[PDB]
Design a protein around this ligand. Structure first.
Ligand SMILES: [Mg+2]
Ligand SMILES: [Mg+2]
Ligand SMILES: [Mg+2]
Ligand SMILES: [Mg+2]
Ligand SMILES: [Mg+2]
Ligand SMILES: [Mg+2]
Ligand SMILES: [Mg+2]
Ligand SMILES: [Mg+2]
Ligand SMILES: [Mg+2]
Ligand SMILES: [Mg+2]
Ligand SMILES: [Mg+2]
Ligand SMILES: [Mg+2]
Ligand SMILES: [Mg+2]
Ligand SMILES: [Mg+2]
Ligand SMILES: [Mg+2]
Ligand SMILES: [Mg+2]
Ligand SMILES: [Mg+2]
Ligand SMILES: [Mg+2]
Ligand SMILES: [Mg+2]
Ligand SMILES: [Mg+2]
Ligand SMILES: [Mg+2]
Lengths: 55, 145, 182, 134
RNA sequence: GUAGGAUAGUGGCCUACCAUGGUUUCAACGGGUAACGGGGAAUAAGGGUUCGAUUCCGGAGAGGGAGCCUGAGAAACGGCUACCACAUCCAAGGAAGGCAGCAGGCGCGCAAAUUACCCAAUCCUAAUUCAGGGAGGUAGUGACAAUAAAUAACGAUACAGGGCCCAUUCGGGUCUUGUAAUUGGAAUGAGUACAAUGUAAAUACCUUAACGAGGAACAACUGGAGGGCAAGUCUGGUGCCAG
């Protein structure tokens, strides 16, 4: 089309029934854990949202 | 060099005058003074304006990126002036339709163009009392025709 | 027509949003002293900021001369009462550098955890929220209470409710009922 | 268990109004809420006043049961209490009766109507009756 | 200026007669203001800049402009008289009007609430303890703005991370942490609800009995995820399109 062709063309994938990421302070706690407590692995450098290791 | 401006202890009025004079080179200040917004500027120096959709018009974009930018020729209600409002997101123009009331907003640049869409200054926000973004989302539905 | 009830948009956002290091620091602070948001941190900063400003102002006049002497002294006293300032440090120029961490540490948030009671910061907070903990014999349920040091020894579990041990409390009752039925 | 530990803080004797006015302070340990009648009774027992001339208001309990902090007066007599205390208070107590009246708006309307007419209404009525034929 | 007139009184306020002054580049005069003035507001190193219709103080106005009665005090508009502009009621001869009080409607607009409850407070007026009061308060609507903070917490068992008595290979795991529709005991007020509190009467608050949490809920949205700038070289759909 020549008026929002792309929105109509895509396949609608459905929201997966995943568990709630808890609200308020819980989230903050989780974030903290992710950051400073657990300490993510680094070959040389830190990274917040890593990739599946590939090109 | 004493550097232009009078540094005397009683040279204050003159200084003030000079400052005032200078003020008329500053563009924003000038605008504020003369009421360019109140005398021109399709809107009445306002945030928004309701306007009637006269027709749907695809406008060809500036350069680099090449496309048709699905704008609308809007007639503002309060003044009677005629402007061109870009319509955001996928489709959206269909939703807007034709001869509808349409609540416009400024595009962002305190007047002026917005990037690539030449001769275009306004976002359509609401069409006949809803909201375009909302419509696009389908979080809220249109009130029929 | 009565009078405008006054307020302050007290607790103020930083001037840049995404100074990454700063953000990280904030997060760390939150983790340490179990906060719901950066908002709390900001508030704390503002509180401290004001104090710092006051100190600066005082300094900008001569210590010996009057307002500086008195007002500053009063401020120092207040700080001491709050329990952020130490007893070694009561020289105004010490207030100047108090730090937000110290402020955080003085909360009824942490003064539950520091005195045992809870076990694990968040838990303490939850307890405070849920109508336990009475600083006097009057039930505080604000986490950001700021304990008075003079009344830190007096922090107990509530006269009423469990843990203090007046009533067992709802789930327990249900269990008892079930047992009875059985 | 509790014993309704009542106190009477800030006692101002009032020869002008003919009363003892004061802050009622009261405790609940494990009971919750004191009740007004009970408070009055307690006051009477204390002061040798009788509920009839005791008169209490305000309060709002502290927070987390425990305490309550209202305002209580003990008049020099029942009669005195009656002729000084506002009517609402009396009604609350039970001493006086609730004053049965019309709605405020309605009253206003009535007043307006009255203003609109002149002299006695009897004449007006008569006139209306006369018209009735026309 | 002189004299009168007037005014409660000063005064070119007005009249008579005379003099030719008076203001001005230290911006007079004129024009504009999407200008009522100030207290103040926003911003906030210091200096500033912008805003001030709007809770207090002043000033104006009651559709416009005029005129006046009464009165200590009005050039009053919830007084009158006129003309203009707008409009109502009519048996056509004539009458009545003025929300920029409150509520409400249209209208305009991007843009703003109930035709509610009462004098209990606050104060006000009178012939006045006693009446009245859309001044004022009380709720209603209200994400204007502001403050305070719930949206699980502690277990156990079950699978993994960390200290390690010793590292002939193990491993107990003696000690501490995170993950599982396990499960279990302990609260919770958001809801509801006798009561009692409040209150003018009510609501609502605070106080309580009773019920009310286990992912199906007693469910957090908004924006973003190349840079500026916190965070995806993930997967597909697209293929100068639509965005
Ligand atoms: Mg190109
Ligand atoms: Mg309780
Ligand atoms: Mg004279
Ligand atoms: Mg102004
Ligand atoms: Mg004006
Ligand atoms: Mg003003
Ligand atoms: Mg205006
Ligand atoms: Mg005023
Ligand atoms: Mg009008
Ligand atoms: Mg007038
Ligand atoms: Mg009126
Ligand atoms: Mg008036
Ligand atoms: Mg009105
Ligand atoms: Mg609004
Ligand atoms: Mg009012
Ligand atoms: Mg509401
Ligand atoms: Mg709560
Ligand atoms: Mg999202
Ligand atoms: Mg996006
Ligand atoms: Mg994306
Ligand atoms: Mg980045």
């Amino acid at each position: 089309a020549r008026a929002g062709k792309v929105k109509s063309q895509t396949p609608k994938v459905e929201k997966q029934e995943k568990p709630k990421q808890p609200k308020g302070r819980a989230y903050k706690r989780l974030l903290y854990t992710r950051r400073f407590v657990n300490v993510t692995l680094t070959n040389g450098k830190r990274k917040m949202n890593p990739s599946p290791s590939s090109q | 060099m004493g550097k232009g401006k009078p540094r005397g202890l009683n040279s204050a009025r003159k200084l003030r005058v000079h400052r005032r004079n200078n003020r008329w080179a500053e563009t924003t200040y000038k605008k504020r003074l003369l009421g360019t917004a109140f005398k021109s500027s399709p809107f009445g120096g306002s945030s928004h304006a309701k306007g009637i959709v006269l027709e749907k018009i695809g406008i060809e974009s500036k350069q680099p990126n090449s496309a048709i930018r699905k704008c609308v020729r809007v007639q503002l209600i309060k003044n009677g002036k005629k402007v061109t409002a870009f319509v955001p997101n996928d489709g959206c123009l269909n939703f807007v339709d034709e001869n509808d009331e349409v609540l416009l907003a400024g595009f962002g640049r305190k007047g002026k163009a917005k990037g690539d869409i030449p001769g275009v200054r306004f976002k359509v926000v609401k069409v006949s009392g809803v909201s375009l973004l909302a419509l696009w989302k389908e979080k809220k539905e249109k009130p029929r025709s | 027509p009565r009078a405008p009830r006054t307020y302050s948009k007290t607790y103020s956002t930083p001037k840049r949003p995404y100074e990454s290091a700063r953000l990280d620091a904030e997060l760390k602070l939150a983790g340490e002293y179990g906060l719901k948001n950066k908002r709390e941190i900001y508030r704390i900063s503002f509180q401290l900021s004001k104090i710092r400003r006051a100190a600066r102002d005082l300094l900008t006049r001569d210590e010996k001369d009057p307002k500086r002497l008195f007002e500053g002294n009063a401020l120092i006293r207040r700080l001491v009462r709050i329990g952020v300032l130490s007893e070694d440090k009561k020289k105004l120029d010490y207030v100047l550098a108090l730090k937000v961490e110290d402020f955080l540490e003085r909360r009824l948030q942490t003064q539950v955890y520091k005195l045992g009671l809870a076990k694990s910061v968040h838990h303490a907070r939850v307890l405070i929220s849920q109508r336990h903990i009475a600083v006097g014999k009057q039930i505080v349920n604000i986490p950001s209470f700021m304990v008075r040091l003079e009344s830190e020894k007096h922090i107990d579990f509530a006269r009423t409710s469990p843990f203090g041990g007046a009533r067992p409390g709802r789930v327990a009752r249900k269990r008892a009922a079930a047992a009875g039925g059985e | 268990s509790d014993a309704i530990t009542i106190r009477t803080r800030k006692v101002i004797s009032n020869p002008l109004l003919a009363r003892k006015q004061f802050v009622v302070d009261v405790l609940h340990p494990n009971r919750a809420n004191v009740s007004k009648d009970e408070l009055r009774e307690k006051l009477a027992e204390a002061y040798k006043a009788e509920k009839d001339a005791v008169s209490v208001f305000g309060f709002r309990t502290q927070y987390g049961g425990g305490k309550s902090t209202g305002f209580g007066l003990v008049y020099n007599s029942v009669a005195d209490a009656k002729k000084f205390e506002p009517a609402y208070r009396l009604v609350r107590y039970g001493l006086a009766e609730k004053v049965e009246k019309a709605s405020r708006q309605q009253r206003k309307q009535r007043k307006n109507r009255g203003k609109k007419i002149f002299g006695t209404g009897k004449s007006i009525a008569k006139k209306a009756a006369r018209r009735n034929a026309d």
